[PDB]
PDB file of C-alpha atoms and ligand atoms in Angstrom:
ATOM      1  CA  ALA A   1      91.149  98.615  93.586  1.00  0.00           C
ATOM      2  CA  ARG A   2      87.665 100.147  93.688  1.00  0.00           C
ATOM      3  CA  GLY A   3      88.024 102.322  90.579  1.00  0.00           C
ATOM      4  CA  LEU A   4      90.154 103.327  87.620  1.00  0.00           C
ATOM      5  CA  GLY A   5      93.558 104.278  88.996  1.00  0.00           C
ATOM      6  CA  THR A   6      96.426 103.117  91.147  1.00  0.00           C
ATOM      7  CA  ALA A   7      96.813 104.547  94.636  1.00  0.00           C
ATOM      8  CA  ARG A   8      99.865 106.470  93.395  1.00  0.00           C
ATOM      9  CA  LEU A   9      97.886 108.121  90.577  1.00  0.00           C
ATOM     10  CA  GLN A  10      94.089 108.103  90.382  1.00  0.00           C
ATOM     11  CA  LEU A  11      91.799 109.193  87.552  1.00  0.00           C
ATOM     12  CA  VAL A  12      89.271 111.808  88.647  1.00  0.00           C
ATOM     13  CA  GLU A  13      87.407 112.630  85.444  1.00  0.00           C
ATOM     14  CA  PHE A  14      87.528 111.767  81.753  1.00  0.00           C
ATOM     15  CA  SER A  15      85.072 112.912  79.095  1.00  0.00           C
ATOM     16  CA  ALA A  16      84.877 113.402  75.345  1.00  0.00           C
ATOM     17  CA  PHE A  17      82.173 115.921  74.517  1.00  0.00           C
ATOM     18  CA  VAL A  18      80.819 118.331  71.915  1.00  0.00           C
ATOM     19  CA  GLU A  19      79.418 121.838  72.386  1.00  0.00           C
ATOM     20  CA  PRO A  20      77.053 123.055  69.629  1.00  0.00           C
ATOM     21  CA  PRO A  21      77.717 126.476  68.067  1.00  0.00           C
ATOM     22  CA  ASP A  22      74.793 127.983  70.019  1.00  0.00           C
ATOM     23  CA  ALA A  23      76.404 127.028  73.341  1.00  0.00           C
ATOM     24  CA  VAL A  24      77.504 130.675  73.573  1.00  0.00           C
ATOM     25  CA  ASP A  25      73.850 131.750  73.670  1.00  0.00           C
ATOM     26  CA  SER A  26      72.857 128.960  76.082  1.00  0.00           C
ATOM     27  CA  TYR A  27      75.389 126.410  77.278  1.00  0.00           C
ATOM     28  CA  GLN A  28      74.784 122.752  76.535  1.00  0.00           C
ATOM     29  CA  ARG A  29      77.262 119.939  75.981  1.00  0.00           C
ATOM     30  CA  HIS A  30      76.789 116.364  74.775  1.00  0.00           C
ATOM     31  CA  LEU A  31      78.913 113.582  76.277  1.00  0.00           C
ATOM     32  CA  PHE A  32      80.183 110.903  73.908  1.00  0.00           C
ATOM     33  CA  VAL A  33      81.789 109.187  76.914  1.00  0.00           C
ATOM     34  CA  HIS A  34      82.191 110.195  80.548  1.00  0.00           C
ATOM     35  CA  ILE A  35      83.968 108.825  83.616  1.00  0.00           C
ATOM     36  CA  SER A  36      83.420 110.660  86.912  1.00  0.00           C
ATOM     37  CA  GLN A  37      85.147 109.350  90.046  1.00  0.00           C
ATOM     38  CA  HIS A  38      84.689 112.424  92.244  1.00  0.00           C
ATOM     39  CA  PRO A  39      83.052  97.047  95.627  1.00  0.00           C
ATOM     40  CA  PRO A  40      86.303  95.962  93.955  1.00  0.00           C
ATOM     41  CA  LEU A  41      86.524  95.769  90.182  1.00  0.00           C
ATOM     42  CA  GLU A  42      86.110  92.658  88.057  1.00  0.00           C
ATOM     43  CA  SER A  43      88.979  90.995  86.231  1.00  0.00           C
ATOM     44  CA  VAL A  44      89.824  90.541  82.546  1.00  0.00           C
ATOM     45  CA  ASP A  45      92.833  88.624  81.237  1.00  0.00           C
ATOM     46  CA  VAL A  46      95.130  90.971  79.316  1.00  0.00           C
ATOM     47  CA  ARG A  47      96.104  88.074  77.040  1.00  0.00           C
ATOM     48  CA  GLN A  48      92.550  88.178  75.645  1.00  0.00           C
ATOM     49  CA  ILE A  49      92.831  91.699  74.179  1.00  0.00           C
ATOM     50  CA  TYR A  50      96.400  91.448  72.889  1.00  0.00           C
ATOM     51  CA  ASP A  51      95.222  91.382  69.265  1.00  0.00           C
ATOM     52  CA  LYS A  52      93.369  94.697  69.645  1.00  0.00           C
ATOM     53  CA  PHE A  53      96.647  96.561  70.282  1.00  0.00           C
ATOM     54  CA  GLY A  54     102.353  97.709  72.709  1.00  0.00           C
ATOM     55  CA  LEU A  55     100.110  96.239  75.388  1.00  0.00           C
ATOM     56  CA  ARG A  56     102.067  93.016  75.941  1.00  0.00           C
ATOM     57  CA  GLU A  57     105.321  94.992  75.891  1.00  0.00           C
ATOM     58  CA  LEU A  58     103.906  97.422  78.461  1.00  0.00           C
ATOM     59  CA  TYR A  59     102.330  94.710  80.628  1.00  0.00           C
ATOM     60  CA  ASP A  60     105.517  92.639  80.863  1.00  0.00           C
ATOM     61  CA  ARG A  61     107.282  95.896  81.746  1.00  0.00           C
ATOM     62  CA  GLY A  62     104.731  96.276  84.543  1.00  0.00           C
ATOM     63  CA  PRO A  63     103.436  96.937  87.070  1.00  0.00           C
ATOM     64  CA  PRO A  64     100.382  94.677  86.663  1.00  0.00           C
ATOM     65  CA  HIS A  65      98.040  96.663  88.916  1.00  0.00           C
ATOM     66  CA  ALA A  66      98.467  99.836  86.829  1.00  0.00           C
ATOM     67  CA  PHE A  67      96.571  98.313  83.881  1.00  0.00           C
ATOM     68  CA  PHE A  68      92.817  98.753  83.460  1.00  0.00           C
ATOM     69  CA  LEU A  69      90.231  97.958  80.792  1.00  0.00           C
ATOM     70  CA  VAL A  70      87.274 100.256  80.109  1.00  0.00           C
ATOM     71  CA  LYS A  71      84.468  99.572  77.673  1.00  0.00           C
ATOM     72  CA  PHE A  72      82.344 102.549  76.634  1.00  0.00           C
ATOM     73  CA  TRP A  73      78.772 102.484  75.398  1.00  0.00           C
ATOM     74  CA  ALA A  74      79.103 105.788  73.577  1.00  0.00           C
ATOM     75  CA  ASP A  75      76.276 108.267  73.049  1.00  0.00           C
ATOM     76  CA  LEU A  76      76.303 108.987  69.304  1.00  0.00           C
ATOM     77  CA  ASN A  77      73.011 110.925  69.063  1.00  0.00           C
ATOM     78  CA  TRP A  78      73.415 114.707  69.063  1.00  0.00           C
ATOM     79  CA  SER A  79      77.162 120.254  63.076  1.00  0.00           C
ATOM     80  CA  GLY A  80      80.373 122.264  63.289  1.00  0.00           C
ATOM     81  CA  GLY A  81      80.658 122.747  67.051  1.00  0.00           C
ATOM     82  CA  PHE A  82      83.743 122.432  69.208  1.00  0.00           C
ATOM     83  CA  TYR A  83      84.857 118.866  69.946  1.00  0.00           C
ATOM     84  CA  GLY A  84      86.818 118.388  73.143  1.00  0.00           C
ATOM     85  CA  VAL A  85      88.456 115.805  75.383  1.00  0.00           C
ATOM     86  CA  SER A  86      89.097 116.408  79.091  1.00  0.00           C
ATOM     87  CA  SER A  87      91.247 114.371  81.481  1.00  0.00           C
ATOM     88  CA  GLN A  88      91.974 114.914  85.168  1.00  0.00           C
ATOM     89  CA  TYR A  89      94.183 112.930  87.552  1.00  0.00           C
ATOM     90  CA  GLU A  90      95.003 113.229  91.246  1.00  0.00           C
ATOM     91  CA  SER A  91      97.954 112.072  93.331  1.00  0.00           C
ATOM     92  CA  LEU A  92      99.648 112.613  96.678  1.00  0.00           C
ATOM     93  CA  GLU A  93     103.088 112.934  95.059  1.00  0.00           C
ATOM     94  CA  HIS A  94     104.225 115.941  93.040  1.00  0.00           C
ATOM     95  CA  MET A  95     105.091 114.554  89.597  1.00  0.00           C
ATOM     96  CA  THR A  96     105.255 115.639  85.982  1.00  0.00           C
ATOM     97  CA  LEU A  97     103.014 113.424  83.857  1.00  0.00           C
ATOM     98  CA  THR A  98     103.329 112.257  80.264  1.00  0.00           C
ATOM     99  CA  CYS A  99     100.020 111.050  78.806  1.00  0.00           C
ATOM    100  CA  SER A 100     100.255 109.180  75.504  1.00  0.00           C
ATOM    101  CA  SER A 101      96.978 108.407  73.710  1.00  0.00           C
ATOM    102  CA  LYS A 102      97.348 105.954  70.826  1.00  0.00           C
ATOM    103  CA  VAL A 103      94.243 105.357  68.702  1.00  0.00           C
ATOM    104  CA  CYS A 104      94.339 102.122  66.698  1.00  0.00           C
ATOM    105  CA  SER A 105      91.959 100.988  63.961  1.00  0.00           C
ATOM    106  CA  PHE A 106      92.187  97.238  63.264  1.00  0.00           C
ATOM    107  CA  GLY A 107      95.298  97.138  65.452  1.00  0.00           C
ATOM    108  CA  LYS A 108      97.042  99.806  63.345  1.00  0.00           C
ATOM    109  CA  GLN A 109      98.015 102.986  65.195  1.00  0.00           C
ATOM    110  CA  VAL A 110      96.141 105.775  63.399  1.00  0.00           C
ATOM    111  CA  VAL A 111      96.651 108.776  65.704  1.00  0.00           C
ATOM    112  CA  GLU A 112      99.007 109.194  68.665  1.00  0.00           C
ATOM    113  CA  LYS A 113      98.882 112.115  71.120  1.00  0.00           C
ATOM    114  CA  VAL A 114     101.541 112.838  73.753  1.00  0.00           C
ATOM    115  CA  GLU A 115     100.932 115.541  76.367  1.00  0.00           C
ATOM    116  CA  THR A 116     102.779 116.858  79.416  1.00  0.00           C
ATOM    117  CA  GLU A 117     101.189 118.365  82.524  1.00  0.00           C
ATOM    118  CA  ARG A 118     102.854 119.222  85.835  1.00  0.00           C
ATOM    119  CA  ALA A 119     101.291 118.969  89.257  1.00  0.00           C
ATOM    120  CA  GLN A 120      99.266 121.540  91.184  1.00  0.00           C
ATOM    121  CA  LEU A 121      98.670 121.724  94.939  1.00  0.00           C
ATOM    122  CA  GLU A 122      94.927 121.810  95.672  1.00  0.00           C
ATOM    123  CA  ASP A 123      93.539 120.936  99.126  1.00  0.00           C
ATOM    124  CA  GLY A 124      95.897 118.188 100.243  1.00  0.00           C
ATOM    125  CA  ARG A 125      95.890 116.723  96.720  1.00  0.00           C
ATOM    126  CA  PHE A 126      97.980 117.128  93.567  1.00  0.00           C
ATOM    127  CA  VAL A 127      95.670 117.756  90.606  1.00  0.00           C
ATOM    128  CA  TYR A 128      96.697 117.273  86.968  1.00  0.00           C
ATOM    129  CA  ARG A 129      94.513 119.106  84.454  1.00  0.00           C
ATOM    130  CA  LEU A 130      94.334 118.419  80.710  1.00  0.00           C
ATOM    131  CA  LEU A 131      90.927 119.979  80.188  1.00  0.00           C
ATOM    132  CA  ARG A 132      89.208 120.899  76.922  1.00  0.00           C
ATOM    133  CA  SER A 133      91.872 119.496  74.616  1.00  0.00           C
ATOM    134  CA  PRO A 134      90.524 119.704  71.039  1.00  0.00           C
ATOM    135  CA  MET A 135      89.706 116.309  69.581  1.00  0.00           C
ATOM    136  CA  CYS A 136      91.647 114.923  66.635  1.00  0.00           C
ATOM    137  CA  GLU A 137      90.116 115.864  63.295  1.00  0.00           C
ATOM    138  CA  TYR A 138      90.276 112.188  62.329  1.00  0.00           C
ATOM    139  CA  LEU A 139      88.235 111.337  65.425  1.00  0.00           C
ATOM    140  CA  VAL A 140      85.704 114.082  64.668  1.00  0.00           C
ATOM    141  CA  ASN A 141      85.310 112.643  61.163  1.00  0.00           C
ATOM    142  CA  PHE A 142      85.189 109.065  62.474  1.00  0.00           C
ATOM    143  CA  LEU A 143      82.590 110.071  65.065  1.00  0.00           C
ATOM    144  CA  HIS A 144      80.712 111.873  62.298  1.00  0.00           C
ATOM    145  CA  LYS A 145      81.062 108.942  59.891  1.00  0.00           C
ATOM    146  CA  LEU A 146      79.976 106.468  62.581  1.00  0.00           C
ATOM    147  CA  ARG A 147      76.925 108.631  63.293  1.00  0.00           C
ATOM    148  CA  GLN A 148      74.912 107.939  60.107  1.00  0.00           C
ATOM    149  CA  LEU A 149      75.514 104.207  59.984  1.00  0.00           C
ATOM    150  CA  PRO A 150      71.980 102.927  59.257  1.00  0.00           C
ATOM    151  CA  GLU A 151      72.030 100.296  62.028  1.00  0.00           C
ATOM    152  CA  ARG A 152      73.261 100.056  65.604  1.00  0.00           C
ATOM    153  CA  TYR A 153      74.866  96.667  64.921  1.00  0.00           C
ATOM    154  CA  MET A 154      76.871  98.149  62.041  1.00  0.00           C
ATOM    155  CA  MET A 155      78.148 100.776  64.486  1.00  0.00           C
ATOM    156  CA  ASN A 156      79.109  98.006  66.909  1.00  0.00           C
ATOM    157  CA  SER A 157      80.687  96.088  64.020  1.00  0.00           C
ATOM    158  CA  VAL A 158      82.924  99.033  63.095  1.00  0.00           C
ATOM    159  CA  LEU A 159      83.740  99.837  66.733  1.00  0.00           C
ATOM    160  CA  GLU A 160      84.878  96.226  67.219  1.00  0.00           C
ATOM    161  CA  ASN A 161      88.158  97.243  65.532  1.00  0.00           C
ATOM    162  CA  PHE A 162      88.498 100.693  67.152  1.00  0.00           C
ATOM    163  CA  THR A 163      90.605 100.860  70.319  1.00  0.00           C
ATOM    164  CA  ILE A 164      92.456 103.483  72.359  1.00  0.00           C
ATOM    165  CA  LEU A 165      95.504 102.835  74.554  1.00  0.00           C
ATOM    166  CA  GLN A 166      96.112 105.346  77.357  1.00  0.00           C
ATOM    167  CA  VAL A 167      99.644 105.414  78.795  1.00  0.00           C
ATOM    168  CA  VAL A 168     100.428 107.769  81.688  1.00  0.00           C
ATOM    169  CA  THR A 169     104.046 107.838  82.871  1.00  0.00           C
ATOM    170  CA  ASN A 170     106.083 109.884  85.319  1.00  0.00           C
ATOM    171  CA  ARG A 171     108.082 112.010  82.877  1.00  0.00           C
ATOM    172  CA  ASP A 172     111.057 112.463  85.208  1.00  0.00           C
ATOM    173  CA  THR A 173     111.524 108.808  86.199  1.00  0.00           C
ATOM    174  CA  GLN A 174     110.104 107.337  82.932  1.00  0.00           C
ATOM    175  CA  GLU A 175     108.187 104.772  85.017  1.00  0.00           C
ATOM    176  CA  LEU A 176     104.638 103.714  84.199  1.00  0.00           C
ATOM    177  CA  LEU A 177     101.862 105.038  86.449  1.00  0.00           C
ATOM    178  CA  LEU A 178      98.562 104.195  84.740  1.00  0.00           C
ATOM    179  CA  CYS A 179      97.537 102.284  81.617  1.00  0.00           C
ATOM    180  CA  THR A 180      93.957 102.107  80.339  1.00  0.00           C
ATOM    181  CA  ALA A 181      92.637 100.212  77.315  1.00  0.00           C
ATOM    182  CA  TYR A 182      89.401 101.463  75.752  1.00  0.00           C
ATOM    183  CA  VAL A 183      87.003  99.210  73.828  1.00  0.00           C
ATOM    184  CA  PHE A 184      83.926 100.715  72.231  1.00  0.00           C
ATOM    185  CA  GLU A 185      80.319  99.819  71.676  1.00  0.00           C
ATOM    186  CA  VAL A 186      77.488 102.294  71.046  1.00  0.00           C
ATOM    187  CA  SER A 187      74.706 102.946  73.545  1.00  0.00           C
ATOM    188  CA  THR A 188      71.072 103.241  72.525  1.00  0.00           C
ATOM    189  CA  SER A 189      69.410 106.605  71.958  1.00  0.00           C
ATOM    190  CA  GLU A 190      67.481 106.479  75.239  1.00  0.00           C
ATOM    191  CA  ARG A 191      70.525 105.594  77.349  1.00  0.00           C
ATOM    192  CA  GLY A 192      73.397 108.017  77.779  1.00  0.00           C
ATOM    193  CA  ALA A 193      77.095 107.317  77.603  1.00  0.00           C
ATOM    194  CA  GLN A 194      78.169 104.498  79.917  1.00  0.00           C
ATOM    195  CA  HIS A 195      81.380 102.799  80.996  1.00  0.00           C
ATOM    196  CA  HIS A 196      82.470  99.645  82.746  1.00  0.00           C
ATOM    197  CA  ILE A 197      85.925  99.539  84.330  1.00  0.00           C
ATOM    198  CA  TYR A 198      87.769  96.221  84.440  1.00  0.00           C
ATOM    199  CA  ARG A 199      91.253  95.440  85.739  1.00  0.00           C
ATOM    200  CA  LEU A 200      93.810  93.709  83.519  1.00  0.00           C
ATOM    201  CA  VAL A 201      95.411  90.639  85.097  1.00  0.00           C
ATOM    202  CA  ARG A 202      98.016  88.082  84.006  1.00  0.00           C
TER     203      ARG A 202
HETATM  204  C1  LIG B   1      93.861 112.353  68.836  1.00  0.00           C
HETATM  205  C2  LIG B   1      94.180 113.067  70.129  1.00  0.00           C
HETATM  206  C3  LIG B   1      92.905 113.472  70.826  1.00  0.00           C
HETATM  207  O1  LIG B   1      92.380 114.541  70.572  1.00  0.00           O
HETATM  208  N1  LIG B   1      92.426 112.609  71.714  1.00  0.00           N
HETATM  209  C4  LIG B   1      93.189 112.219  72.907  1.00  0.00           C
HETATM  210  C5  LIG B   1      92.359 111.116  73.492  1.00  0.00           C
HETATM  211  C6  LIG B   1      92.606 110.301  74.586  1.00  0.00           C
HETATM  212  C7  LIG B   1      91.653 109.334  74.920  1.00  0.00           C
HETATM  213  C8  LIG B   1      90.467 109.156  74.192  1.00  0.00           C
HETATM  214  C9  LIG B   1      90.153 109.952  73.083  1.00  0.00           C
HETATM  215  N2  LIG B   1      89.049 109.871  72.301  1.00  0.00           N
HETATM  216  C10 LIG B   1      87.846 109.309  72.557  1.00  0.00           C
HETATM  217  C11 LIG B   1      87.403 108.980  73.834  1.00  0.00           C
HETATM  218  C12 LIG B   1      86.154 108.406  74.009  1.00  0.00           C
HETATM  219  C13 LIG B   1      85.333 108.175  72.914  1.00  0.00           C
HETATM  220  C14 LIG B   1      85.770 108.508  71.641  1.00  0.00           C
HETATM  221  C15 LIG B   1      84.886 108.258  70.458  1.00  0.00           C
HETATM  222  F1  LIG B   1      85.338 108.943  69.425  1.00  0.00           F
HETATM  223  F2  LIG B   1      83.660 108.648  70.751  1.00  0.00           F
HETATM  224  F3  LIG B   1      84.884 106.970  70.169  1.00  0.00           F
HETATM  225  C16 LIG B   1      87.021 109.078  71.465  1.00  0.00           C
HETATM  226  C17 LIG B   1      91.148 110.971  72.714  1.00  0.00           C
HETATM  227  C18 LIG B   1      91.113 111.963  71.585  1.00  0.00           C
END
């Protein structure tokens, strides 16, 4: 694969953002993370991130190529605005998707989010839109609380135990389509949000 996504279901865009209250007057938005997919990928052993998450249960269930690892270098420099998460997938089949998002701190599932979104025909492609979903209030507080840590390495220390498991399944057939594991560091002030996309093997 050359990017995040199987060839049965591919991730177009994924972003967690904030819009300040004066975005109505003049629109700006700040990206905590961002993936835009609109050279093959490097390999990471899934046995090496088992402790951070069920990943082993899902991986043995398969298929292996559906599993990806993304690390974010989040932008945490930017209160009371809207906090949003947007996801967008594309496929050549017409499916109904179930997208579970399990957020674990220290391996303990803190928040889980399950969503359903059915296909839409758009220019020879089937587009799945989960745009502008409000962020969990826990995650807004955690992002807030992480923001005034006095040191960058303390932020990285806390984020060492903070993981997100993305599970996208065909709702009708119950089969797994895409699985992404998110591991977090914090980017510097001068750099924006960044990602690297690995592929989980073995
Ligand atoms: C709790 C449900 C929710 O609103 N939600 C669904 C998600 C799916 C995937 C990822 C995230 N959150 C996320 C993504 C990137 C970076 C962050 C961080 F807070 F900046 F660390 C959070 C959510 C949130």
